[PDB]
Amino acid sequence: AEELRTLLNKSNVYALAAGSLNPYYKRTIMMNEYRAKAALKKNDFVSMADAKVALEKIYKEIDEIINR
Amino acid sequence: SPMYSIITPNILRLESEETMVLEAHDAQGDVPVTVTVHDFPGKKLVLSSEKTVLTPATNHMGNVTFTIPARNKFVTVQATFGTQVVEKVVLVSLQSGYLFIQTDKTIYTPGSTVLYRIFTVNHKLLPVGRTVMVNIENPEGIPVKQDSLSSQNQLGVLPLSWDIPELVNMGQWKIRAYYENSPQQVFSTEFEVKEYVLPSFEVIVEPTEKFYYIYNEKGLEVTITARFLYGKKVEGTAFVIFGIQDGEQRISLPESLKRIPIEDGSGEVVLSRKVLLDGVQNPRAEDLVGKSLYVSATVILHSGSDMVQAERSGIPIVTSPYQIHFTKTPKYFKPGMPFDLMVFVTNPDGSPAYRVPVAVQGEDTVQSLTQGDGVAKLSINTHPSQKPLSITVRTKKQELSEAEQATRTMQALPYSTVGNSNNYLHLSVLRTELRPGETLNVNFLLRMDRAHEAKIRYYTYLIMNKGRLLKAGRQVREPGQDLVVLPLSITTDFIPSFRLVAYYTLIGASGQREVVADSVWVDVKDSCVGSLVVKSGQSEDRQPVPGQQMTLKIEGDHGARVVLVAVDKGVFVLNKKNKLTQSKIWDVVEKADIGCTPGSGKDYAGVFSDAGLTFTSSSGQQTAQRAELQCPQ
Amino acid sequence: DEDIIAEENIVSRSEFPESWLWNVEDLKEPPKNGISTKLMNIFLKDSITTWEILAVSMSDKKGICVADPFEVTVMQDFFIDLRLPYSVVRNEQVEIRAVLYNYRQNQELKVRVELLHNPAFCSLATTKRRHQQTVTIPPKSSLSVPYVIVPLKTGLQEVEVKAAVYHHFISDGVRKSLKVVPE
Amino acid sequence: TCNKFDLKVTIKPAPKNTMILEICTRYRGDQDATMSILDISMMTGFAPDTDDLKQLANGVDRYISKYELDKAFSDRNTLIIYLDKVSHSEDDCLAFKVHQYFNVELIQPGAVKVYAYYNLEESCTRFYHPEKEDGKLNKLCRDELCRCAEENCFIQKDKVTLEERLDKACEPGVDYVYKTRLVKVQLSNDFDEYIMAIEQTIKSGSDEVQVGQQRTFISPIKCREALKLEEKKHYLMWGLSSDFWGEKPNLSYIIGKDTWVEHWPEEDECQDEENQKQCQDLGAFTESMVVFGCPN
Incomplete structure (x- = not known):
């Protein structure tokens, strides 16, 4: 959907914060930016939903970690 | 005649609560006791306090816990009952408690940092504030660093470290630690320094039996297991050679060396009976019994990229699958009074064997089955004999053969009575495993002539635990009752084992004062007092990943300080020695018992000393004086 | 690519x-x-x-x-094991193995693996040219990629290989360090 | 050092590409060794002649797990030959052919390693390559120090224009540009040494070298065919600051993967109607660099 492309946007904001944090995080985003980008460029429903969930999730974990 | 009697441990500890057990026998109404511990010899009054009164409401039985501050040192205890004053001289020990040391790993590289903790605790395992010396000895025994640190307000835990210089002696280092006050009592862990790199997988060799039977012609059959430290099964090729050890001498059996593939993480190999004998070739097979075997496996991944060596050692050569042990059975029997044997049946490696029937010589029915802890209890009867008792227990495992059964012999001497009064006491309890929370029936059996049995209206029982007096009470008894039963409740306070010793006293023979006593050692199922689980707190889900956050759940005792550490399981492929374990602890704790005999003694005075107690009376009956710091041997 | x-x-x-x-x-x-x-x-x-x-x-x-x-x-599912030795001798050419593991159940991998450039080492990687093979790895199976190198200077020197798989957006790289010791 | 096992590895072509990989590791002891092994690795792109594997596979004191013998070209870049025993008298020898399927330029030397199973320490590693000496790549070692010399060499010998020159010569790394004379030439086993006088200092970074001072440039002997530098002629070159060898001002220079080579015709040579174009480009390069400097 579009709702994904919206999330992608936040990726730069999140990766910026995720630099205090284990390499894992700033690396999950990478992994899922390439996925988002390339799925949005095929309109595959499965690959986009997949990625939409991956972002939502990793951002949330990043949220939680940062709040503490 | 009132008799006043005074009981305390054989050995008294400094800066810790000991208990004195005060008694008034054949006495009327209130009696005031003032108890006192002075230096030896002379007068200093290392502790005056502690005063109490015995009442017919408490049948004249009393505590009073005292604390002694703080060549071999001795104190003089001295309790005054009214005017009559009883005094005994007890041995003292500067040993504050225990030390346990933890190293983050078992093995280290030059130029890394050894992380180690030191736990400071008293003789009852609780944390303590003290001053300790620590020493890192090199492998040739040279102290090469020492910190003198105090664990006051440290809450039992002393974190330390030491960086190994890049330039240093390879081999087994030691960390030796002792209390400032008890420099003779030292504590040690080891750790290997070595040049190495963590392998990527582990290799496991187990014989299909934890021993070799010298007439089993199939030989010694082995399985070799390989598997990357992350789960997945290993594909490769493996070299396994055997060898014989006796006792620190090893002899390889080159003719035994085999190369076998490892497929789906497994290969198989055998040391034919043939090659073993042709290999050592001592005149006869039976020569090898008592010697041990080893399998040495070396596994090469197919890439050639990684390789790993590994060993199972000390597989005993045996004529029998078992061994019998009277180390838990008292060596003194009471003529005319049943003699209980705790037969301890182990496997060849050392583990307890379970469900193993054992019987005495002939027997000829009898028989009883070994329990979980590898203990079964046979009871035979004794006569009016004073000659030594020589019992022999053979295992009666079906499916075996007279050849293969184990055997063993032991001997008890009779308990000597006061001028041959043929008065005795016999404690029996049920042999089954004991957990805290359960309750234990302690059978009090009494032997004496009906002409005098009625004078015995009570027994006194003292529970010994970790070398301190833990509980003492009175077990009543109505004339005619030969057997009475005190239902003892087992709490965590009892771990990891306790001795129960009990005594009745009367005037008898010719208006003669007689103390008659027995004792018995009972094993509690070893475990933590509190608890400590470390589980995943990541409710649900699947594997975690490099770098990821992970949640841990810690379940343990309130307000307890917990210290962690995490180790690459590859470290353990290289060295699995010298790891810290609740078991290694309790074992330390048992090896510090002031009690020496599994129960009973040569006479009343023995029963006490052997169990770790001292006994003293206004009449003069009492234990010998213990002046030795350890048990005899 | x-x-x-x-x-x-x-x-x-x-x-x-x-x-x-x-x-x-x-x-x-x-x-x-x-x-x-x-x-x-x-x-x-x-x-x-x-x-x-x-x-x-x-x-x-x-x-x-x-x-x-x-x-x-x-x-x-996918990752590098960069098996270095404890130490090496300055100026001695040695080989190291980069082991590639593919743990997907039934789903091979087309992977490009690269030994990164270090001026502290001499390899087929130079400051301008890369050292990448492209290999295909069967499912539940591993792959060994050798790397000849020469340590140039002593000290705690560090080796790095990366790798990513195509069409999938999996990626991984390892940066262990080992001891370069004088002749 | 190969203390316990004498090892000789030989790569010669065959009688797509394919060649003969041979060897022989003698045992330096008084008797023969315990089952021993070779961790064999391949020049990039080669895979064993599966057939030649089985001739090895059934042999006496020879085995390759039916695991490896089976992988084939596919992706079998490792394989282990289990030689039951070993010699100390002469040398257990064996060989086999490799076909580097999928020809691809700039290959890697194979590293054959042998050890007695029970001891990875007492082992060894010898390399090989179709065109390299005993498998060692090309390095330049002057005493305790060293560097890499297995790249390509001097800058590329598609046109060679004038906009193109003014570019490169103003990228960051570039720390000098000189017009020079090749004074003396000293050659030796490892590194040649072209001592050159600096005739004019076009750009000037860290080196505080004047015009005429004379500095010293080095090069691996495997870099002479393609350099053909000639005493007494003139030259314009430039290099990176990362090509400085030494400590002032007895740093020599390195002709390297990013060092520029160009032959500056004499002053009266600028006349040939085939020379002029290079004689005007360069003057129209000297003139820009000296006036304007570099953009950034």
Whole structure:
């Protein structure tokens, strides 16, 4: 959907914060930016939903970690 | 005649609560006791306090816990009952408690940092504030660093470290630690320094039996297991050679060396009976019994990229699958009074064997089955004999053969009575495993002539635990009752084992004062007092990943300080020695018992000393004086 | 290349302790049946192995208690094992193996693996030309990629290989260090 | 050092590409060794002649797990030959052919390693390559120090224009540009040494070298065919600051993967109607660099 492309946007904001944090995080985003980008460029429903969930999730974990 | 009697441990500890057990026998109404511990010899009054009164409401039985501050040192205890004053001289020990040391790993590289903790605790395992010396000895025994640190307000835990210089002696280092006050009592862990790199997988060799039977012609059959430290099964090729050890001498059996593939993480190999004998070739097979075997496996991944060596050692050569042990059975029997044997049946490696029937010589029915802890209890009867008792227990495992059964012999001497009064006491309890929370029936059996049995209206029982007096009470008894039963409740306070010793006293023979006593050692199922689980707190889900956050759940005792550490399981492929374990602890704790005999003694005075107690009376009956710091041997 | 992860984007794994989590927690946690329960948030080290966690408690009421180990296995469908030796001799040419593991159940992998450039080493990687093979790896199976190199200067010198798989957006890289020691 | 096992590895072509990989590791002891092994690795792109594997596979004191013998070209870049025993008298020898399927330029030397199973320490590693000496790549070692010399060499010998020159010569790394004379030439086993006088200092970075001072440039002997530098002629070159060898001002220079080579015709040579174009480009390069400097 579009709702994904919206999330992608936040990726730069999140990766910026995720630099205090284990390499894992700033690396999950990478992994899922390439996925988002390339799925949005095929309109595959499965690959986009997949990625939409991956972002939502990793951002949330990043949220939680940062709040503490 | 009132008799006043005074009981305390054989050995008294400094800066810790000991208990004195005060008694008034054949006495009327209130009696005031003032108890006192002075230096030896002379007068200093290392502790005056502690005063109490015995009442017919408490049948004249009393505590009073005292604390002694703080060549071999001795104190003089001295309790005054009214005017009559009883005094005994007890041995003292500067040993504050225990030390346990933890190293983050078992093995280290030059130029890394050894992380180690030191736990400071008293003789009852609780944390303590003290001053300790620590020493890192090199492998040739040279102290090469020492910190003198105090664990006051440290809450039992002393974190330390030491960086190994890049330039240093390879081999087994030691960390030796002792209390400032008890420099003779030292504590040690080891750790290997070595040049190495963590392998990527582990290799496991187990014989299909934890021993070799010298007439089993199939030989010694082995399985070799390989598997990357992350789960997945290993594909490769493996070299396994055997060898014989006796006792620190090893002899390889080159003719035994085999190369076998490892497929789906497994290969198989055998040391034919043939090659073993042709290999050592001592005149006869039976020569090898008592010697041990080893399998040495070396596994090469197919890439050639990684390789790993590994060993199972000390597989005993045996004529029998078992061994019998009277180390838990008292060596003194009471003529005319049943003699209980705790037969301890182990496997060849050392583990307890379970469900193993054992019987005495002939027997000829009898028989009883070994329990979980590898203990079964046979009871035979004794006569009016004073000659030594020589019992022999053979295992009666079906499916075996007279050849293969184990055997063993032991001997008890009779308990000597006061001028041959043929008065005795016999404690029996049920042999089954004991957990805290359960309750234990302690059978009090009494032997004496009906002409005098009625004078015995009570027994006194003292529970010994970790070398301190833990509980003492009175077990009543109505004339005619030969057997009475005190239902003892087992709490965590009892771990990891306790001795129960009990005594009745009367005037008898010719208006003669007689103390008659027995004792018995009972094993509690070893475990933590509190608890400590470390589980995943990541409710649900699947594997975690490099770098990821992970949640841990810690379940343990309130307000307890917990210290962690995490180790690459590859470290353990290289060295699995010298790891810290609740078991290694309790074992330390048992090896510090002031009690020496599994129960009973040569006479009343023995029963006490052997169990770790001292006994003293206004009449003069009492234990010998213990002046030795350890048990005899 | 077409449809893979760009080398510059791959942040290598680097933190491979033999031990860690050398921490200290009190259990003041409002108890609940003489049983207190803490939760603890740790960040796993990039090693792909099985951590064995050991806890030891100390209560002035209950004494000392050593727990049973708690194992934790840390894994990835796809990853590099960069098997270096403990040490090497300055100016001696040695080979190292970069072992590639593909753990997907039935789903091979087209992977490009690269030995990064170090001026502290001499390899077919120079400041302008890369050293990438492109290999295909069967499912549940591993691949060994050798690398000849020569240490130039002594000290604690570091080797790095990365790798990504095509069409999939999996990626991984390892940066271990070893000891260069004089002739 | 190969203390316990004498090892000789030989790569010669065959009688797609394919060649003969041979060897022989003698045991330096008084008797024969325990089952021993070779961790064999391949020049990039080669895979064993599966057939030649089985001739090895059934042999006496020879085995390759039916695991490896079976992988084939596919992706079998490792394989282990289990030689039951070993010699100390002469040398257990064996060989086999490799076909580097999928020809691809700039290959890697194979590293054959042998050890007695029970001891990874007492082992060894010898390399090989179709065109390299005993498998060692090309390095330049002057005493305790060293560097890499297995790249390509001097800058590329598609046109060679004038906009193109003013570019490169103003990228960051570039720390000098000189017009020079090749004074003396000293050659030796490892590194040649072209001592050159600096005739005019076009750009000037860290080196505080004047015009005429004379500095010293080095090069691996495997870099002479393609350099053909000639005493007494003139030259314009430039290099990176990362090509400085030594400590002032007895740093020599390195002709390297990013060092520029160009022959500056004499002053009266600028006349040939085939020379002029290079004689005007360069003057129209000298003139820009000296006036304007570099953009950034």
